[PDB]
Amino acid sequence: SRRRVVITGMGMLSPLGLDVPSSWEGILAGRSGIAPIEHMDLSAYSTRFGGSVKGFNVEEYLSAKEARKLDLFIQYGLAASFQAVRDSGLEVTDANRERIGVSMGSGIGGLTNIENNCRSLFEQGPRRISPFFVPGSIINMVSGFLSIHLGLQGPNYALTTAQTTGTHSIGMAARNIAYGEADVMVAGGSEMAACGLGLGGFGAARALSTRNDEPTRASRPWDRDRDGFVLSDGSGALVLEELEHARARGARIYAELVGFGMSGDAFHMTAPPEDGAGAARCMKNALRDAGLDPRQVDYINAHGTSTPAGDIAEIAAVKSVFGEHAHALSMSSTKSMTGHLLGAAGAVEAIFSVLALRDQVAPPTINLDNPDEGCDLDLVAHEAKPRKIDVALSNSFGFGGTNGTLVFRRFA
Amino acid sequence: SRRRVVITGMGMLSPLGLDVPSSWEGILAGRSGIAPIEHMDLSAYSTRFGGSVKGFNVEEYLSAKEARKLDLFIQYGLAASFQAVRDSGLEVTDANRERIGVSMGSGIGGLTNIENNCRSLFEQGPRRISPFFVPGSIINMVSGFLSIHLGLQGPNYALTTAQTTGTHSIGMAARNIAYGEADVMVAGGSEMAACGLGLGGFGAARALSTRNDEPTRASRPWDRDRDGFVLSDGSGALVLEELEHARARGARIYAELVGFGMSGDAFHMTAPPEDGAGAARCMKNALRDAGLDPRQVDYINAHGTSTPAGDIAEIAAVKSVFGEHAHALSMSSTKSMTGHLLGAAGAVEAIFSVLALRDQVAPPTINLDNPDEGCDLDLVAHEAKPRKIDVALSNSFGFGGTNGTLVFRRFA
Ligand SMILES: CN1CC[C@H](Oc2cccc(F)c2)C1=O
Ligand SMILES: CN1CC[C@H](Oc2cccc(F)c2)C1=O
16 A cells, blocks of 8 residues: 655755755755856857856765776766665665665767767777677666665666656655655656767757856746746756655654645647646646645746746746636746756755745745746745745756656654 | 456567467567668668568558657557557546557657767757657657547557556556556557667677577577577557446457566666576566465466576566476566567566466467576477466566566456
């Protein structure tokens, strides 16, 4: 029968910091993590900025010898996973190793590594492709490497659902624990798509903000002058744990995961429906899964990507689900500060939702100078808002019309 | 408690055929799908052969214009998915579309597309990258495109667990139905990694057979002269359906999916443990899930990749799990004929496991001329073996030590 699931550990790399507390300080201070990209020459690209992880030292986590073999998305995923496991206090033993699994996902995975090995192949020949190309690039290897390093013998898998990946990974890992397939899961996502193919590929679709001359103001969810998403790098990991398991070991519990929804739009490969029908269906599924009155929802961490169609679809979805209560909750997009971590977005935003519950504060939507037509909810413009938050909801939507909602609440 | 899950539709592209009955005819005849790779210069490569899909016509499924937007692995996954839904006779309606979902995965995803866009990027610069590069290359676009085309609003996701993808995709879709999150799922996997990057990436790790002189004899699981796996392309999809739902509409039921196991080895990034400890835990997990004694298993579709370490690990795991029953079951590798479809391997082998139940016949392991030391199980050498089969297992083991087992049972 269905068991309860709590959050006992969190870890993060973001454009605002190399761990959770540092990232969260930047979130509450309204700081932007967005800057011109330094790691490559983007003069031929229409977008030349994004949210880089600054000053990451992989030798805080792994030997230089093994790090050299791994794409940055794997390095970031392992860093966030190690932080979350350490933060949990959990001890892996022969007695519990078969009951601890991992589900760390990615939207695109090791695009930097694949681009670099493609360069080798085309300029030199296949004899210059790294022997570590496959295990160092494919998406499941965050889960794989984490399991090898910590001895986790529970369910070992990875989701790839584009910009919904982090939310789906956390939700499905919670279901694993709920249904008794595991007692503990490390779950979240990681992304590092800032290579030529990433910036060039989103750029060819004209999906990215082109505000090169003012990167910190580029990400402006629900602002009338928004012109697309800002591409960002990093990782989020959570340690999810069965309630009675967490209670038995005296774990510090941050919050309870009470609800998870998934819905397909079945609308369009890349565009969200204007009325937010898929996001509404997904949130309704998550609220019914959590056994909630929608009026219990105090805070929504929006997907809020700073796209014309995405941002207004989300307002439509929230008004349709919450009716008059839409005017009482607070909804914000931390992508205003972090940009869009793609497969990692739902993972870092799940952590931000849990911290909104811990600290009783709604993170701001920075850059919301001129709210667009119909964008008339409390979107927490400019400044963090202290308020009562018993229930927080984190939304993600992605290519393929794939939707996820997580519902968290305070645990006493 | 838990609902029962049955298989009501199947679809396939493989090196043996453009559908299930053609592929299965090849399997029972001991035919090889392996041949030198055409329309591609492999001069500088140590492997020049594999399992190609021959004569695939995407315009049976999609307009030329929609097919141009999508990597071959997505085309393949859609073809298998459309076949499986057709084969099921399911009528999608406003009354059931929120109860029908998709989980089609891939191990490596859009390497061919990435390769072609890399070529453009390096030669001409980022303005030649396709606008459809991202949505046409990401692994969740089989689930995304299928849901949009058929109007499916149930759970929409994609697994990526390397060579375990197809097995995990089917098992987790079965859990969705068992626990009431969907009534129908389309599940399986697709792969097309016969590009410079795939053949070069696996070749760089010396993982591939280099028997260029005799491609049809290269894949020789448990044979003392095996020298690595054969890379193959294609797709498998199954329609999974809640039993009462299948019975109410008068569905043709092929078999019941009674068990699913997952385990991590936590051993090595690419190598299995020699004693097959992870595969043994995974099979025991799947049998416990099914409420079956190891003695009830009649047929195992092995991972059986033709690698020195992997093939011997699987013998060890089977001897360990099945004890005095280990010789009574038949265990065969259909990869002897199909080669290794990586993320689709588990999907097409689940289909072969189901057809073994329908037709009461164990597929052969072809090329098993000289069983290796300790390879003394009933490996169905050379020729198909008619036999009693009530319970069939399908095993997948992949990079990151990720394991999957599906247990299928005759249904009447
Ligand atoms: C309404 N719009 C705006 C952008 C999006 O189109 C795309 C298309 C391809 C890749 C991508 F990243 C985005 C859409 O459907
Ligand atoms: C048991 N053996 C044989 C090859 C494999 O090693 C690799 C390593 C990297 C990529 C790959 F494709 C394979 C292994 O560890």
